[PDB]
Structure formats: C-alpha cells, structure tokens
C-alpha cells in the first residue's frame, strides 16, 4: 500500500493499556497463582502468551473470569512476566532467572525463554 | 531499574490484537457510523482515542455494547482510522484526507490530526 506509519504508535498503545491495568479499568480476568491474584485484560494476555491464546480461544474457557495456574508456578515469576507483557521490560535477575524461565516456558513466551537460556549459558 | 527490553514487543502485541480483530475474537463493542458497523476491542479504542477513552471510563457508557457516532462522521474516514489504531499504518490519500482529519479531530487522535494538517499545508 501507500500508507504512512507512526513509529511510536505501538509503544504508546501498550503504555495506555498498562495505565488501564494499573487503574483496574476494563480488566476482565483474574489469574490465580498459589495465594496471589493478578488482574489483567484477556486480549493482552493472548497477544503475549501461547498458553493464554489457547485458553481464551477455547469456546468454554473464553467466558471464565478466573484462571488458576499450575501450583508449580511461582507468583513472583508470573508478576515479572505480566509486567513484561504490558511494558516490553523484563526484570531479569540472578535470583529470579530460573523462576522467570520456567514460568515463560509454561506461558509459551518464546522470546523470554530465548533470553533466559542465553543469560544462563553466559554464567 | 536494571530491566532489559525487547524492541519488537509492542509491535508484536499490536499485530496479535489486529489478528484477534480480523477473526472477531473477544471484540466487546460495535461502533455504528451511519449505516456501517465496526467491531472492536474497547481497550484498543481507548488506548488510541481521547474520545473513546472518555466514553469507556464513564461509569454508565463503559457497559454499552453499541456506540453510535455523530451522523456527520464518514464511515470510510472511521475505517481508515480504526485500521491505523490496530496497525500504526495510515492510508492517507488526496481523496480521503479531509474526511480522515475531521474524523481524527472528533476521535481526538492528536498525532493523526498533526500529520493531516502538515500534508494539507504542503498542497
């Protein structure tokens, strides 16, 4: 086509979606990880995770307001990944990298799994 | 912070949100423009437009599944802008620039209004 493109549009959209999350506006699901609860937008979860994409395209699970993750999933690893989904920023540290990689493999977030494998290989 | 960043994350998120729109997955509103109907995600509309942000943060309008725009709004101008919201790409042409600018002013999409003003000033 003969379209023009606004370079910062996608980043600005994601910034506003994170502002809506922080104010709990139009969140439509709660992700339960052990004792911890995380509110989010199903569309953003699907856009970032192969696991959530599969869950919310299912004709029965698409209507659930609560999703319980596998009890092996660490709440901190999930929190770091949820923050990454809404910001593009990953808080990867020596003390959390194993929990982050395991959570990213479960959530099917290929690019996060790739950077965790590379950072572990370096050490 | 000490975060790392994935450059393509925001663009990849927006690409997936457009894939969901194209398949009519988790769309939660229909925007009526004269005789024409457009399905979309309220969160994406809010993230891109000052008008939709105001509408869906309203305690009564947040629950509406149908929004009717002002009858002066041109369906083609709206379609071009909805496509821009989900792609960052604007199909700006000599034959549609006046309708696109008027629709962007109504929708409160400041960056689109700015490029339309500049393209009109050049001609």
């Amino acid at each position: 086509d003969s379209c023009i493109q606004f370079t910062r549009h996608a980043s600005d959209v994601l910034l506003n979606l994170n502002r809506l999350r922080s104010r709990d506006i139009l969140t439509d699901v709660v992700i339960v990880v052990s004792r911890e609860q995380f509110r989010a937008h199903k569309t953003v979860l699907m856009a970032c995770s192969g696991l959530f994409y599969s869950i919310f395209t299912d004709q029965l699970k698409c209507n659930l307001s609560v999703i319980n993750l596998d009890p092996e999933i660490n709440p901190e690893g999930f929190c770091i990944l949820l923050d990454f989904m809404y910001t593009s920023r990953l808080n990867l540290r020596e003390g959390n990298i194993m929990a982050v990689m395991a959570t990213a493999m479960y959530l099917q977030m290929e690019h996060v799994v790739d950077t965790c494998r590379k950072f572990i290989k370096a050490s | 912070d000490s975060c790392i960043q994935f450059t393509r994350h925001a663009s990849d998120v927006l690409l997936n949100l457009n894939r969901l729109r194209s398949r009519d997955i988790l769309t939660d509103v229909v925007i009526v423009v004269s005789r024409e109907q457009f399905r979309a995600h309220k969160t994406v509309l809010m993230a891109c437009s000052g008008l939709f942000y105001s509408i869906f943060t309203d305690q009564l309008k947040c629950n509406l599944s149908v929004i009717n725009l002002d009858p002066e709004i041109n369906p083609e101008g709206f379609c071009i802008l909805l496509d821009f919201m989900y792609t960052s790409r604007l199909n700006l042409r000599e034959g549609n620039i006046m309708a696109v600018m008027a629709t962007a002013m109504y929708l409160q999409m400041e960056h689109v209004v700015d490029t339309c003003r500049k393209f009109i000033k050049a001609s």
């Binding site: 379209c3 023009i4 493109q5 370079t7 | 790409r89 604007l90 960056h111 490029t115």
Partner: peptide
C-alpha cells in the same frame, strides 16, 4: 511519521 515514516514511509514503512
């Protein structure tokens, strides 16, 4: 704005 750019030419993509």
């Amino acid at each position: 704005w750019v030419i993509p």
